[PDB]
Design a protein around this nucleic acid. Structure first.
Ligand SMILES: [Zn+2]
Lengths: 264, 243, 231, 236, 230
DNA sequence: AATGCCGCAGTCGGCCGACCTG
DNA sequence: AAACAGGGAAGTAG
DNA sequence: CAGGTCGGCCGACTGCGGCACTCGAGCTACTTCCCTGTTT
DNA sequence: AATGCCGCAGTCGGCCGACCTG
């Protein structure tokens, strides 16, 4: 019976429900039969997997990328550096981008925020060139690269790009500004001291100030590396797409999407 | 340890208190470390400021430097500008607001650009009152830092050097009490809501701390060292309460 | 890229051996091998054992091959014939060379299913019962041709065994011996966006997987969003 | 269990530790296996320093010349018997030794004229191997002890067959006190799953990896593993 | 054109044979042979016969091969083994297939040098005492792999033998069968560079015809630019 | 050489002081 | 005669 | 034993994305490598 | 002068019979 289903699929490539209704077989059997055929296309609409890590302490993990504000003319190359714990953002408008420009932007950001433990960027040639590497080595800052051609690896700074562009458009429509430096300074001022969240905290109050530790709950936890629901474990942070469990035996916090977290 | 302290002082040349508080060195030891360096010789934050324009010859064309200092935390921001006219002062004001925030009022001198109607109405828009020995001190400090950072002449433009100097003065230089300028400026200064507990590292076998606690439970505590990156699970036998 | 020329001239191994033992460029190794004139589960589970004829050895034309079906570890001898006596001798030496497996899938030759061999295999707790064995045949013939001045057929035959086992390795860098004494996934490319595979999965964890296509040289990191379980 | 060990040592004459680890028996059980059996009464890393010498076996006759190649680190023992001990003979044995083991660097030999001959030296130098001038004789004692055990086991057509059997029993299936055969020392999670094609819980069998909720369960199918969602797996 | 396509699909002959049978362009023959997925003194003087294994014949993997050294005429019958009885049967069937030789060349296998075979050959006034046979083996294996669905091994072997013998012709257009029943130094008069050696077809009264193996057509050159070889 | 994200805006739902009313 | 220093191409990633 | 339990079963639900008329070209930017004019 | 849809696959969960045990 099942082999007849297999050969019928190999001939026609029917639908799973078609096989189930025609040959009186278990639905999961039809799903596996349609899975095993090389000819049938493989799944592309995969649900969310993985998550961008973010240091639980301010000034630990940053992100960095460039963009293009064509309204700035010769100064269209904008460098954006945003922390991951607090979403504190900083940006400058440097003509072009290179080792010198990235170094100057890095020094400005360091002055504006502080020493970061490590920085995660894309694989642009400037961030891969050695000069930046020994600069960070002298400044004792670890560096990460990220998978090539994967903007989701820098999704945080990409969303920050969205925010910055929206703010710049708003301000430019509002009035007149001398130079793109002035406009960018105003936009960063708004985004970092005025654009408060819904918890009574500006960007400054989050990046600086005290880390808040209310009694954190414990939840069931699906460990993707063993295909099992192991727990309970302490939940450090959570949000719209991320969760940070921390089992006692685990050496470091583990980042998993929300749907793999079940309350207990 | 202390060799890394000497390396850090070579890179930045901060005050001795910063070294002795960040690397657990003996106070006098950090004192000679600073000495051996060749070039080393209000009531609330965001309330009252002072602004002046100074001159530094080393920049040459950008000798017009604006200095903006808070009177409670000494949080210092500065910029090298091509002119002392009204427009450059306005640009520096906007960038200083981006750096530090909104001050209640700014105290300045009688410079003709400052008195100009444009600055008055700009401060009127931003609701910042204008009124006509802390910043001349800052002029010395920034000038001194520029001299010490001139050891490594790899700075492309005066912006790079000024950014490095402001970074040191605002995030690395610590007071005699153990606080940087940025912490005072953002003023989380209050009684600690959460306990700060002692911690006994396994690798060294010594009580290192105090460090901030996160959680606890079932024989373990989730301590989070200041210099570390991720929380460290520690048995309760090596955890000591601290006030 | 200095010693590679003489190493190839002596052993005539594949370009993978050059690039992994001498830390040279892949294109460099390809050029070296092309320019050369003479170069134109778990281990010990299932075995294949066939006889082949080579005319070079003369009256020693009866080569017996015994290739493991997992690690492709290869052993061979040259004997005066292919009778039960001879296959028994070669089987004893193959066991001395590779240990004790449990299944040897062999062909239906009368000497292979004779009595003496049958109780001999029964005593040592073995079972009974193809492209692997003929592929190994082609490799052995190619290596024997590439070895052209040796003393006796045993000499260059042992040399061919040595270069086939302890010198050559696959794309992963693991030689035949290392595979013998030391995952299959559909993945999506990121440049074109079209799926390619199936390919081997070195290791993975927490949203990113490592894929080593057999036609490429370096491992590829892909996000777990683009990983499919082939078969 | 016991009778399997009895047959194994009777037709094979293993030592005690390897048999114990293979069949999970009492230590005594193996000791009286040894007693009742009538026929059976340095470097830092593998493949660095080798020792080799010739020795004479009485019963091999025209093949009395026994060449022995033992790795000084792991004691992985390899041996062959030939008609002579000349330069051609030593070269042939070196060829088969390289076939058997791999590429050494350090070789220690005696002061034999063949070993100090120019042909062997140039051959080794061509293969990037350095030749310079207890282990060898104790290895010879072990080899000939295995031989003395093995004659009465059964028919051995040629001394090559007997020598191969002896070296195999001495290297690949015998082991040390640490459950480690010399051969592998030279190179040194069961699950229950649902075959959801047929709906039967086949197993247990080894697991390989995991991820995406998918467990790479590998049955005795020597062709390829299969993927099963983790909802259809249970630890054993 | 299409007839050439179906002929190559059925028999899978070489390009030269297809060209000579169906009168097509040599470029067309090369294209058609490349396109197919399945494509990757006198006669009776001296013979060579060596046995070889073919795995996919199961019990009958011991296939014998006898090739005449003159015309490369080939013969093969898969049998039970390579023992005395099997080699004797194969030799008798080869004699029926191909004709009486004078000399046979074999290796030193015990079966060949066995007393019975020597006595039988002496009974037939035929004496008995190395790349052609291996090349023939390679050709036969290639044809066996190329011919793929047939019923029995004898059927497939006979079909492959027919294709290799009575269908494939060489550059001269002569079948191996018809061939079964001189070197010259020639000057390429265009470039002026000597070439060869090659087979002479006809020559006389100042002009000669030379057919190099790499040329689709005969080349006519004068007697002034022809020199012997060996 | 190392993993999607989240603000703008809608909206359900509960808290609760005020207002109807048994 | 071997060494050494520009420049262009090329691979590669944003 | 039958009330209680667990697994097989699948109804119902949902996160995801690309169908849209077709595909590109090119820039900046750094590294590695080969080639070649210049050196002792 | 006229408006995003939905298959694929994973998954939650309720039903129900074979099965355990009060
Ligand atoms: Zn070669």
């Amino acid at each position: 019976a099942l082999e007849s289903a297999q050969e019928s699929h190999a001939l026609h490539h029917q639908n799973a429900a078609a096989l189930r209704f025609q040959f009186h077989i278990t639905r999961e059997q039809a799903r596996e039969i349609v899975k095993l055929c090389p000819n049938c296309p493989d799944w592309g609409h995969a649900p969310q997997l993985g998550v961008n890590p973010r240091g639980l302490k301010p000034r630990v993990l940053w992100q960095m990328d460039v963009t293009h504000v064509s309204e700035f003319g010769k100064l269209k190359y904008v460098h954006v550096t945003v922390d991951t714990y607090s979403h504190f953002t900083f940006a400058t408008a440097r003509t072009g981008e290179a080792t010198k420009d990235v170094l100057q932007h890095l020094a400005q950001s360091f002055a504006y925020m502080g020493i970061p433990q490590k920085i995660k960027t894309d694989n642009a040639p400037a961030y891969v060139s050695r000069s930046i590497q020994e600069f960070l080595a002298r400044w004792k800052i670890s560096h990460v690269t990220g998978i090539p051609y994967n903007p989701q690896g820098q999704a945080i700074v990409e969303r920050t790009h969205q925010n910055i562009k929206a703010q710049l458009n708003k301000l430019q429509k509002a009035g007149k500004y001398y130079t793109p430096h002035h406009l960018l300074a105003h936009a960063l001022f708004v985004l970092n001291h005025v654009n408060m969240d819904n918890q009574g905290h500006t960007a400054a109050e989050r990046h600086w100030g005290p880390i808040s530790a209310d009694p954190k709950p414990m939840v069931m936890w699906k460990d993707l590396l063993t295909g099992s629901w192991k727990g309970p474990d302490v939940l450090i942070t959570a949000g719209r797409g991320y969760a940070c469990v921390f089992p006692q035996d685990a050496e470091s916090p583990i980042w998993v999407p929300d749907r793999f977290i079940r309350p207990f």
